[PDB]
Ligand SMILES: O=C1[C@@H](P(=O)(O)O)CCCN1O
Ligand SMILES: O=C1[C@@H](P(=O)(O)O)CCCN1O
Ligand SMILES: [Mg+2]
């Protein structure tokens with residue numbers, strides 16, 4: 001026996017919505033994990049199991065998922081007698097048990113919750129820190145501290161402004177270490193808060209779901225101006241660069257794109273994919289933008305491929321690839337992008353998430369580990385990004401502790417790794433060139 | 437020993453400012469604690485030691501405090517040979533080593549960090565959950581789940597609007613359990629978000645430091661109406677009441693009070709304590725307000741006693757008592773208030789915090805364990821409020837996980853208790869009667 005007990009419960013995430021937490025018990029103690037939740041429901045994503053009872057948490061309860069774990073998944077894994085270190089064997093077993101493709105029987109959140117807890121238990125059984133255990137599961141040996149991407153200006157579907165593009169991020173690529181990167185990010189963030197307060201009023205510095213600011217802006221170029229201004233005023237002009245999550249699937253209108261989709265529908269203002277690309281070109285020219293995520297729709301494959309082949313920055317697939325090995329294989333084929341955004345709950349398990357990572361890295365892609373808009377105090381993805389030697393992660397602004405928890409864990413990891421610890425820096429896309 | 441190692445480091449809190457985190461190693465494993473931080477410091481509070489080095493974090497660093505732990509405190513507590521179950525001996529040793537009034541040598545954040553990690557290590561040494569270890573340190577045998585107080589509407593010095601009073605909270609007193617209490621709170625919070633969106637716009641649903649909303653309103657009575665509208669539309673009119681943190685020190689002007697202090701200084705709209713008291717009287721009448729925190733300035737003792745002696749609701753001292761035993765007994769003698777807000781970082785140690793609580797409880801006060809505006813992923817106060825059996829805790833909205841982590845932990849505790857689990861309910865002021 002390795003697994004003594006697997007027990008799941010219902011906790012609240014950063015937004016106040018129910019989510020899955022799983023406690024796994026072995027002889028070496030308690031191992032706890034919680035599942036993040038996206039804002040929108042992707043059609044290619046593995047199914048997030050919700051109760052749908054409108055009188056309880058407005059239908060967002062996860063009692064059915066919890067029960068699947070406690071009544072079905074838990075006794076089955078204990079029956080198998082498989083060690084907690086057999087991550088692949090245990091993950092696979094849950095998949096056959098679920099039988100479906102998108103994990104619709106047990107739910108991806110139920111399967112991931114157990115998967116994450118197993119990985120933590122297995123790490124103690126190997127007597128390795130979590131990031132080291134993940135490293136061996138992936139086939140890595142030379143660890144890397146990632147460049148953090150702090151979203152500081154927010155737009156898109158769930159922002160109060162008119163700003164169409166979702167996230168504007170800062171990347172301290174010129175930092176001495178990760179701890180140094182945290183300082184740079186925080187200082188620019190508080191500098192930005194002052195710039196926004198002076199230009200938009202004191203009632204414009206409240207934060208969104210991920211700790212970023214959402215002042216009333218329409219022009220995407222204007223959002224970049226604020227960010228660059230804050231960077232320069234903080235005194236880090238070329239030690240910090242800019243990243244973007246456009247989330248273009250959110251304003252995809254009949255084959256075109258609406259950069260004012262939160263205004264009354266006027267189909268005349270729509271622009272083509274080529275037009276949207278030329279806009280990006282201007283941004284790269286006028287601003288230190290080094291990475292753009294979801295620049296086009298999740299099914300606009302022609303636009304992705306055409307853009308990637310003609311720009312030298314990082315193109316990140318999110319809604320396009322949804323951490324799905326099948327979608328990734330197609331994206332490699334068509335050269336749609338050159339970076340995979342890794343969301344573990346999109347695919348539903350640790351084993352499959354590692355496979356998706358290796359699939360991208362072996363084809364010359366970069367990877368970027370990512371949070372969800374609904375997060376918990378769980379810090380698994382901090383150990384994940386290091387173990388996978390990814391070199392880049394976005395897990396929120398330096399505000400709200402569902403974000404800081406990840407960043408704090410990474411600072412502890414850098415401390416623990418000592419002289420072996422290497423910061424990705426300007427090599428966040430391709431950290432392998434530093435490994436020595 | 438029994439402590440093998442104490443290593444402190446610099447982490448970031450919920451606002452992105454540096455704070456102290458402490459790792460304490462015993463033979464039974466690693467024990468970790470982090471220190472919260474308020475928006476401002478008073479004259480009676482224990483000193484929070486910052487670096488003031490404008491080369492780093494705009495002077496907000498805590499490398500001095502970390503160094504004081506790693507270089508001075510850590511080798512001393514290890515040298516003592518004291519076991520981790522000896523909370524008081526280890527705390528007193530840090531008190532005399534600091535040897536100052538307000539812990540101004542090492543810093544309160546330095547001393548508390550070790551103190552909290554010691555307490556966690558002590559719980560495991562006696563093979564108990566943390567809240568049970570605290571219960572034995574406090575001299576309690578009972579264990580009850582507190583009523584949570586979620587702030588949902590925010591004003592005061594650090595809110596963007598024009599709202600004078602600082603916090604407006606909802607208290608699910610009529611819930612079946614704490615898990616049910618979380619569900620009621622989250623449903624009203626989400627209901628409120630829709631209410632605010634409809635009346636004040638899409639751009640008004642962004643949150644402040646503790647997760648509460650800050651819509652552009654002026655009238656304090658308007659904040660109460662929004663809350664009540666949310667409670668009723670969610671269908672919990674009978675089960676949810678309202679609490680308030682006024683923080684009146686922030687608009688204390690010329691011996692008067694300014695309910696529009698965030699607007700250019702006008703001495704015309706100033707009102708007296710008697711005038712302010714009457715406004716509270718009307719609030720309590722027209723709305724289910726059962727508790728008010730800091731109704732008057734931290735040194736307007738006349739207004740406090742006069743108002744407390746003329747109401748039945750709960751009166752909570754925050755700026756007034758700052759978890760300071762000396763100020764607490766003065767508040768008792770003058771009967772300034774009937775409830776103590778408990779902020780562990782204001783006094784600086786676990787032992788002194790437990791003592792300040794018992795001092796309040798023995799004089800017939802209620803106690804409300806509280807978060808700071810700057811918090812971390814640490815969940816110590818969740819176990820603290822249970823072990824002290826105070827019946828009431830405020831640690832933010834059901835939003836932002838530096839708040840949820842406490843609420844989640846409280847739910848885990850209730851589950852771990854099972855049958856012995858009792859919800860304070862309508863007895864949140866005196867859970868002693870249960
Ligand atoms: O696209 C997104 C959204 P969601 O978590 O809602 O998918 C915000 C969080 C990260 N990300 O890349
Ligand atoms: O008065 C307050 C403030 P701070 O912790 O900033 O004093 C907000 C948090 C709790 N409280 O009672
Ligand atoms: Mg995205």
Ligand SMILES: [Mg+2]
Nearest residue numbers: 681683729754
């Ligand atoms: Mg207060």
